[PDB]
Design a protein around this nucleic acid. Structure first.
Ligand SMILES: [Zn+2]
Ligand SMILES: [Zn+2]
Ligand SMILES: [Zn+2]
Ligand SMILES: [Zn+2]
Lengths: 49, 262, 262, 253, 253, 49, 49, 49
DNA sequence: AGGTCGGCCGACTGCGGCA
DNA sequence: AATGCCGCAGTCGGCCGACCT
DNA sequence: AGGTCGGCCGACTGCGGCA
DNA sequence: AATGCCGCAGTCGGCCGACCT
């Protein structure tokens, strides 16, 4: 599965990207483009496709 | 058909409502058409900052910048998340020893938690801090980097402290920055009373006077379904907590996921 | 007594609630004690930005900064406040002639108002603008300096234009900045349909029509009293308009001052 | 009143119809105002078939390529003083005509490369606009563009007595404004009005309004509402509806 | 378990009472833990009468002027390592004691100028604190401060085996923490607890908790709620309340 | 003008007396009692009857 | 797992079929129909019955 | 009558000051310290005394 | 003695702004 | 690797006291 | 033929963020 | 001298159609 997601740090809107997990106020995204998993608030996650 | 509705949407990015009338389709059909628009982009209440279930469980800590006192702007602040019991230390920096100073003082002032949450600053990440946590046996949460809401309790507290310091400074002169600050802390925990007739200190060290609670339906966003009904532990402006027999741990959610069961 | 409540308040700036429990006084007594505190500094809906009663009455105009096009960022925007009919011109500046360019175009695009409201920029204050207005016989309101809400209709419109441009730019390449802009304007007034099944253009120049309205009680903040009841002209999200037989002019207020009369 | 009729005539040079409908001028008097001026000698639905053409306003000399789109129904004229006859110049004009006029069901152009391009055909497909080839030239289509070009130029000529424009676009836009929003037909309607098409079987009542400031009936004006012995009418040039004791109102038929 | 009792004893050097109440240690064993350690040899309401005093902790030499405030009820000790005995030093200390302790009904000091100042008297009026003049010396009041100073110094001496403090305030604050929040009396209560005064006729039921992970009875623990055949109890060191089948719960009396 | 207002400090109706002005739901009551003008919330105003 | 969902585009109930995951009130439905994964709003989910 | 008022331009809180008028979303404040009348919106006005 | 009304008071809510 | 908050000060509805019927 | 239920659709609402 | 707004996309309640009784 995949999602869209806001870059909490710079504010730039990112995605679509590799959805790893989510729930209870959080989400995890992780492309192999990234060095490590993207751990963000679920308020910035949109249900891509 | 919907194909032409999508076609037109792709072409002009037509309003879902317009699509409804133009193509004679349902709202939900129109909504999906615009939802699938890769070039098209709302933030309702979703997450919630949870808190301790009784005093001396979860504390929250961060710093601020009270420029009024120059170097002393580095005020270190710790709050008991259950009782909203506050404590602050006007230091001249964010060194290990300034963090520690505050902590030492907060141990005497507040006591000792099971766990504490800070932001992701190096002032807390440092091994030496991690050592203190090991010495005192306290769990440490840092939250998500750059998300100020992880420290929302103390940030909201900072507003209160700031305001308190302002009105007290307007009230007169103080011997030291600490004289002012202590006065503020005094008021914040021993003078300022809530709508239940109790002070923050009173809540912090008061005996657990528990009240009976009603059963509610509880929506789990990971299943998309209403569960229970079961007895709600607590709630407040915008939030609620429930802990079912079949649950692994206490559940903190926004109160819009609560539906009082008849 | 209240004297000691006030004393304590002056000293510590004690919470009104706390004062109630400490001094055994009413909320309102406690509220006055803290209200009279000069050292104790809340902003609920109060005013409202009014609008025309029919198309081509009151327009609103301002500019923005679409950095995407460099110098062309100076987009001049005019909106029919009644119908929310929008028009924009990507100029390369804010010179008198850029204002006039836009205006000339808006006369062809929208038509002609009875009055227009702008901000307090010299681009509108200039005698040459006032000359133009004298020639075309249009009243000019500048609003309160530095208060962006005087231009709230076009500012909100700017959000819409911006978003529209973003979607459309992502959708493909354009020959010119104006090609894109015109595409957006087309959509905004002829494609984008409202929840009544009508377009902005349609509202701007549609058939004269009106729906019958109920009487409501109307609170006048200058008297502190409910007046009427009388037939409400209109309303929308957060606002309402009524014009009584005994009133001098139409009355625009927030809709929280409306109480539907039985 | 007629002093200001003459004033606005000097400013825009609108026709006798517009002058007299607004100021209640004897048709003859309105014509006098005009002749004394130093520069003043289809289907059933709008947005269906548009007539396209391009001219060469030498008065500009650079923007002389004025692209023109005319609603064959209302005779609404939209024009863009372009720098050439490129397919992109056409498309740019077209995009602008969408903002001003909207999207038709079909458009009639000539057979020039400026319209032939498959990229344009693509756009016509995108906007579901059927193309009329322009091959069947006749006095109807010719009169549409001939009258249009003459009318445009006539207004532009009128504005040569007030050459206070910075660009050709300031000049043209002003002209087009008058041409579509100021000048009136024999029924008092404008080209824009007709183009828009709001004119239909309007069920709303109109009343004669005794303007008590004059002690006489004006209008008829569209009645908005009524109650408690007064009627709420909203006149053309009024800024707001006016409550008037029912006894001074005359339901107009 | 007692290994960590010994660990925390090394860290804070809490008394035998604290050790055994937390770890369920034979009183004798708790005393053994203590003796083997290299540095371990009123009215009815709190916040009423406080005992004030100042000492000279030469170990600091600059902050040696430790101002001390003791709740005569709970024997809670608050202290501020000041740089002198000025009236402003006293007031600064006092302000800090308000934050930590609160405001009393009266405070007993000696007759030093450090307390005499009318500015202090004013402050006492502001806070409605009656002043006990402390003109006569009395073994009762003397024992309060004597025991206090000895206890403070005892803890400070204990912390000389772990002199890892940046300031005297880091050291003292740590000491005070242990003195008021860690050490327990014969009933398992702390000075802070007593100072606070939450202890009263607590109507809440407690239950024995069969901790099924061990298969044994723990507590008794304060019961929070119950339903559907399970009871929700929340133990001292538990992070959260625990649902347990009623049959494994014993209403404790 | 002469209006009566609830004594915001005791609850007793005071006046009717000299109201100076009003606005935003408040009534600035101010007779010769120079101790303080009083912006009384409109709901507590009862005009001379 | 095997859950049925209202066809967001036609209204017909589809499946029950391969649900991949869920979160934030959505259910990422995605069987072998590679055309698109579908985050279906939870209210439209009816598990195999 | 007098009111407190926020400085719309800089954001600094001003007042107490001379109340001139108010109503329908606006107000006027005008000390002789000022060169001309202070025209501000009602939303920044507090009922001083 | 029961009914009507004022008022007296708790409870709930839009708002802003902390980072 | 976890997740917005809560005081201000208005505003509404309800409960009770006083006084009229 | 009347009753029960799904769903089908309008109506209304928290939210952010333009200056 | 005038004064916040409105689209998004969720969410609730009601009206009507289909189908069961
Ligand atoms: Zn789109
Ligand atoms: Zn105060
Ligand atoms: Zn003329
Ligand atoms: Zn020891």
């Amino acid at each position: 599965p995949m999602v869209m997601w806001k870059d909490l740090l710079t504010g730039s809107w990112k995605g679509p990207d590799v959805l790893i997990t989510a729930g209870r106020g959080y989400a995890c995204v992780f492309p192999q483009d990234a060095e490590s998993p993207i751990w963000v608030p679920d308020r910035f996650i949109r249900p891509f496709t | 058909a919907l194909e032409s509705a999508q076609e037109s949407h792709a072409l002009h990015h037509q309003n879902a409502a317009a699509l409804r009338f133009q193509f004679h389709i349902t709202r939900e059909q129109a909504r999906e058409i615009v939802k699938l628009c890769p070039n098209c982009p709302h933030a309702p209440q979703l997450g919630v900052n949870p808190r301790g279930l009784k005093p001396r469980v979860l504390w929250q800590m961060d710093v601020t910048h009270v420029s009024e006192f120059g170097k002393l702007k580095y005020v270190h602040v710790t709050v008991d998340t259950y009782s909203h019991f506050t404590f602050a230390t006007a230091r001249t920096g964010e060194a290990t020893k300034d963090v520690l100073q505050h902590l030492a003082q907060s141990f005497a002032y507040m006591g000792i938690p099971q766990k504490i949450k800070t932001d992701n600053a190096p002032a807390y990440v440092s091994r030496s801090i991690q050592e203190f946590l090991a010495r005192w046996k306290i769990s440490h949460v840092t939250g998500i980097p750059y998300n100020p809401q992880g420290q929302a309790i103390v940030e909201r507290t900072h507003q209160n402290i700031k305001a308190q310091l302002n009105k007290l400074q307007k009230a007169g002169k103080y011997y030291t920055p600490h004289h002012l600050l202590a006065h503020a802390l005094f008021v914040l925990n021993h003078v300022n009373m809530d709508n239940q007739g109790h002070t923050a200190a009173e809540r912090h060290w008061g005996p657990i006077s528990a009240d009976p609670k009603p059963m509610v339906m509880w929506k789990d966003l990971l299943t998309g379904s209403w569960k229970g009904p079961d007895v709600l532990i607590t709630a407040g402006r915008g939030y609620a907590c429930v802990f079912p027999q079949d649950a692994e741990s206490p559940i903190w959610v926004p109160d819009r996921f609560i539906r009082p069961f008849t």
